[model samples]
Every structure is written in C-alpha cells, then in structure tokens.
Target: AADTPTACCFSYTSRQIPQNFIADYFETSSQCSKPGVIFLTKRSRQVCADPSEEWVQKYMSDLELS
Candidate 1:
C-alpha cells in the first residue's frame, strides 16, 4: 500500500463486492485516468470496479441517500 496514499486508488482493481457487502460507493477522482467506482464494503474494506460495466451501474442505481 506504499504506492500512494488513500486520496485515491493508485491502480484499478476489477474486484466487485457482494450486494450485501456494499455499504457505500463513490466515484474516484476525475483526474484519474481510469473511470471507476470506489466501493466500501460493509466490513470496512474497499474495492473497485469498472464504471461502464452493467453490474457496476446496476448497483449504483440503488443509491438513494437523500
């Protein structure tokens, strides 16, 4: 984890989380070359996934944090 601080992901990870494991999700910095979602697992772990994928976008549609 020495590559970079947690300001943003230093590299892309294709790892997807379980629907139940997903606690929160947000977009990585636009300055990053890779467009991805930074998913926070319910267990306090972090994972990433491709933004344009069907399943990734499907999970995002559930966000109603208003």
Candidate 2:
C-alpha cells in the first residue's frame, strides 16, 4: 500500500487555494514525507501567534519565484 522507492518531500508553495480543499487534500494524499517546508504560503501561512510578530521577518523573506 505504499510506493516504497520514490523518496517523498512535502514542499509548501505560496499558492492561493481554498481552505477546505487544503484540509481535504492532505487527508487523502500520501502521508509519508517529512515536510520540507511550511508557512511559506499565503493561505495557510501563520507567523508567531503569541508574540504576534516574532516570525514577521520570515513572512517578508525573499523568494525565488522561478
């Protein structure tokens, strides 16, 4: 029940998509990879919720969109 050879990587992009779709997509997708990235997206990105601005710099970090 698994693809035992192709090493998987969960790469998060800054694509804008529906919240419900995100949830449903993850629920049914292959659950095998170590997330290579997170919080690099527009819809699901969240910075420091407690201090509120702790990760603000990351939100503004440069990206190579090629």
Candidate 3:
C-alpha cells in the first residue's frame, strides 16, 4: 500500500506574502497523472496534474527543502 494512488485536490486559499520574498510559488507545468494542478490564487482556480504519475522526487530523501 506504500505506492498506492492518493486523490489530489485544490483550494481557493490565499496567504499574505511579505514584500521581501515571493510569497508563493508552484510547479504550474509540473507533471501529474491528473488533468490539472491544484492551485491557490486571487482570481481563478485551476488544476495542473495528478500526483500518481507526474509526481517527481528530486533527491530521493537526500535533499531537504530548507
């Protein structure tokens, strides 16, 4: 069950972004089995892709976000 498929969803949530750095970002073109990406924005809601096929692991547990 470790590699099972998980449902992907989106929300209309927005957060305050400080001027110092870009508040948010996304992999708009990132690959996914789903039709569109789950995103958060001011005006529109969109889907990018599914996590089952398109999800990519960059470092394989060797790298950290911070």
Candidate 4:
C-alpha cells in the first residue's frame, strides 16, 4: 500500500520520526492485538508491535506514555 514504509519495524537506535504529514499515534491495549504503537501518516500506516521490542520500549520510556 501507499501508506507503508520500508520494513516498518524499528529498533531503538534505528528510529525515524514521521514527518508533518503523519497523524497522531495510537496504541492498542487490547489483548487480542499484537499490542504496540500504531502510526498513521497521510499516505500510509505503520505498526510497532511487541511492547518488549527495543524501539517500543525506548519510545514508551522517552514519552512516558506507558
């Protein structure tokens, strides 16, 4: 899809902030979902799965959103 990014998976040291065209991020707390951040861009969407994932962990720590 036009809204997908390369790989779409990120590590703590390999993060890329979405540009201005991106929308506010959403996190799923449902047990049915993979459970991670969901980024919406004007053209695409990205999913960051696994709270234990390095990037997701670091991001949560930095943002204090957990």
Superposed model 2: Cα runs more than 4 Å off: 2-7, 20-23, 27-33, 36-66
Alpha-carbon RMSD of each model: 4.6, 12.6, 10.5, 8.3
Highest lDDT model number: 1
- Runs in model 4 with CA error above 4 Å? 1-13, 32-35, 49-66
Per-residue lDDT tens digits for candidate 3, residues 1-66, read 657654444432243222232222244332343333343334443433333332222221112353
- lDDT score, residue 39, model 3? 34
Q: Each candidate's lDDT (Cα)?
A: 0.74, 0.31, 0.33, 0.51
Decoy 4 TM-score against native:
0.37
Which digits, one per residue and each the tens of the lDDT, describe model 4 over residues 1-66?
656443423422245553454454556546432445665566675645456556555555555543
Name the better of 3 and 4 by lDDT: 4
Clashing pairs in 2: none
**Candidates sorted by TM-score, descending order?**
1, 4, 2, 3
lDDT digits (tens) for residues 1-66 of candidate 1: 566744466565656566888888898878776786878888888787888877778788876442
**Could you give me the TM-score of model 1 versus the true structure?**
0.72
Residue 57 local lDDT, model 2: 26
How does each model score on TM-score? 0.72, 0.22, 0.19, 0.37
Model 3, residue pairs in steric clash:
31-54, 32-50, 32-54, 34-50, 36-47, 36-48, 36-49, 37-47, 37-48, 37-49
List candidate 3 segments past 4 Å from native: 1-37, 41-45, 55-66
Clashes of each: 0, 0, 10, 2
